[PDB]
Design a binder for this molecule. Structure first.
Ligand SMILES: CCOc1ccc(-c2ccc(S(=O)(=O)N[C@@H](C(=O)O)C3CCN(C(=O)OC(C)C)CC3)s2)cc1
Ligand SMILES: CCOc1ccc(-c2ccc(S(=O)(=O)N[C@@H](C(=O)O)C3CCN(C(=O)OC(C)C)CC3)s2)cc1
Ligand SMILES: CCOc1ccc(-c2ccc(S(=O)(=O)N[C@@H](C(=O)O)C3CCN(C(=O)OC(C)C)CC3)s2)cc1
Ligand SMILES: CCOc1ccc(-c2ccc(S(=O)(=O)N[C@@H](C(=O)O)C3CCN(C(=O)OC(C)C)CC3)s2)cc1
Ligand SMILES: [Ca+2]
Ligand SMILES: [Ca+2]
Ligand SMILES: [Ca+2]
Ligand SMILES: [Ca+2]
Ligand SMILES: [Ca+2]
Ligand SMILES: [Ca+2]
Ligand SMILES: [Ca+2]
Ligand SMILES: [Ca+2]
Ligand SMILES: [Ca+2]
Ligand SMILES: [Ca+2]
Ligand SMILES: [Ca+2]
Ligand SMILES: [Ca+2]
Ligand SMILES: [Ca+2]
Ligand SMILES: [Ca+2]
Ligand SMILES: [Zn+2]
Ligand SMILES: [Zn+2]
Ligand SMILES: [Zn+2]
Ligand SMILES: [Zn+2]
Ligand SMILES: [Zn+2]
Ligand SMILES: [Zn+2]
Ligand SMILES: [Zn+2]
Ligand SMILES: [Zn+2]
Lengths: 164, 166, 164, 166
């Protein structure tokens, strides 16, 4: 027999992600680089490995949309909600949605896609918000080295991987 | 930091359930009996007890639906997905949905409601899938053709590891 | 070439319906009789013909549910919203949903299923609400002969069928 | 009584559109050109004019998505449904969604975006399906392999019956 695990987490270290569509704000390569770096933030401190899928069903489905986009959390136009991601689980579990009514960038202007994505993927992997104002998982965006609180949090779920 | 802690088991032994709607495939009475029997599978070997409510919110909300039915875990027509249930917790936690595109029965035809419900309720109470091919909590549905059902030891073990013996 | 028709309506006279599930409040036959009678209200004054399907995809999919049930119009518990139906069209077009947190009956108690359904099927066929307080399509439930305003409305869309 | 009257055509000749997001299959520039060309198919033979907006609400909101994407008319993976658009009107009226589980291209491979968009925009402007197998508004997709596209007379007739000639 098997009881469910103590916390929401992926039961496998090899996870896939798919960039379903793209924002008008950045080139395809800029978006790909931002997400690749956001996933590396987490894989650098755990045994997690992420492989990008170009089509089909990935564990983490990434998309850009506005207002109603297929779930119970419609976006709200410019500002306000920026993006959201679902905790580990089947179907929409792990997926990350970005509000395309925001201006996504690879700079300090608008909202930095890499930073928001790194935060969203923390949710995709099982982390909720932190009370630490310097943590990546703090609930408010402010514009890289993963803070220690986020390292302790993610490793409590998946272990450290190679500590080297 | 904070993670998403999971409710490993119900913190109370007295649970409530409500049959929100009914399948066209069986009589109301047949449906009620199948669910009662399915809960008894688990209550018989633990301190758990189930009470049926006819209105309002119950811990375990039971309903039949097809395709997209309110939780974005859509069903898929005949075959494939049969039903699903959420693990212990508030709101949708514990709830069980049955795909009415399946033909539900009190026999070997289509899918036996009692057997599928008993399996789903295992999930509702905190049990994941077993690796023992003879367990109720095994992921594949099979029907014995017998009029009596005996909860396999693996399931007794699992459920009791969470709630203790009755 | 073909432009779209002037009003939302079914482009065929032969329509199907399927009772997907049933309310705990009445027997299966009582529900079937209530819906059969509700459809006859409309077929008796137009060329429409309704055939019940036991499975598969019907033009008019009928179901009972509570709160969130698969669309943008979640129900609200006892009282308030009673049911709703979508105007003619593909997929959810024409479908009718009944709030099972209400008590459905074949009497004057609770909400009469036949009466509410007859009203909902008017929507399923293309009628919106009427200002006539005696009309079946009036927006407020009050507890059979189809009122003249509803006859004029439905025939403006489908014609009278056999006037005999 | 009241029925649900349909907006037979846009009451203004100057329409706006916005490309909300982009497919992974083509460059932003390729996508923009395909949509511009698709609108021009219709504006070339009518008094209609289209203006691209980069933010806010436009009459014709264009987006790519998969499966359930916000309107409960879910897409279905590779093949089958390619895209859909709503007839003239407020809100979702005029909007066009493309199934990104299809491979969109500027050629004969997968589905040609320009050709499918031109067809969808026909719907956005008030045209239903034609019965003429050689029409853009015919329900079945076919690709000529030619670098130039000429709006068939049947479509010119249909669109002009609604908006008049240019
Ligand atoms: C150096 C600090 O780094 C960062 C970077 C980004 C963020 C944020 C990204 C998105 C937001 S938000 O304001 O849009 N809120 C969302 C979030 O925090 O992810 C929430 C998630 C939960 N919600 C939700 O809809 O849950 C669903 C997914 C179950 C509502 C929006 S803050 C915070 C800190
Ligand atoms: C003597 C053997 O007895 C049985 C009786 C029934 C079953 C099954 C019932 C339903 C299925 S299934 O193929 O539909 N899978 C579901 C399940 O195992 O219950 C899962 C549940 C989790 N799912 C899901 O989406 O859950 C969400 C709601 C969290 C996907 C389907 S097998 C298996 C063995
Ligand atoms: C002798 C008079 O006979 C009757 C019988 C029943 C009714 C009613 C049935 C349901 C209601 S309601 O209060 O629940 N409102 C719904 C309705 O009028 O059908 C509306 C429909 C539109 N809505 C909606 O969600 O639209 C969706 C379907 C597009 C909101 C609820 S009144 C009115 C008169
Ligand atoms: C030279 C020939 O040129 C063409 C180019 C493209 C097409 C097609 C594009 C998309 C399709 S489809 O098979 O996906 N059907 C859709 C369509 O015809 O546009 C319909 C639209 C209406 N739908 C729908 O659900 O609309 C809702 C949103 C109201 C269902 C799919 S065929 C046909 C001919
Ligand atoms: Ca590592
Ligand atoms: Ca926003
Ligand atoms: Ca997922
Ligand atoms: Ca944007
Ligand atoms: Ca519950
Ligand atoms: Ca199924
Ligand atoms: Ca069934
Ligand atoms: Ca008739
Ligand atoms: Ca209600
Ligand atoms: Ca329908
Ligand atoms: Ca009820
Ligand atoms: Ca629009
Ligand atoms: Ca498709
Ligand atoms: Ca694609
Ligand atoms: Zn979302
Ligand atoms: Zn967050
Ligand atoms: Zn469900
Ligand atoms: Zn199971
Ligand atoms: Zn509904
Ligand atoms: Zn109404
Ligand atoms: Zn759509
Ligand atoms: Zn079409």
């Amino acid at each position: 027999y098997n009881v469910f695990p103590r916390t929401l987490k992926w039961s496998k270290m090899n996870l896939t992600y798919r960039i379903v569509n793209y924002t008008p704000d950045m080139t395809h390569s800029e978006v790909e680089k931002a997400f690749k770096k956001a996933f590396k933030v987490w894989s650098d401190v755990t045994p997690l490995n992420f492989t990008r899928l170009h089509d089909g069903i990935a564990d983490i489905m990434i998309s850009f949309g506005i207002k109603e986009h297929g779930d119970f959390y419609p976006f709200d136009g410019p500002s306000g909600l920026l993006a959201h991601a679902f905790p580990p689980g089947p179907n929409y579990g792990g997926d990350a949605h970005f509000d395309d009514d925001e201006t996504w960038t690879s700079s300090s202007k608008g909202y930095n896609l890499f930073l928001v994505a790194a935060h969203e993927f923390g949710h995709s992997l099982g982390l909720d918000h932190s009370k630490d104002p310097g943590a990546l998982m703090f609930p408010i965006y402010t514009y890289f080295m993963l803070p220690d609180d986020d390292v302790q949090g993610i490793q409590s779920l998946y272990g450290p991987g190679d500590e080297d």
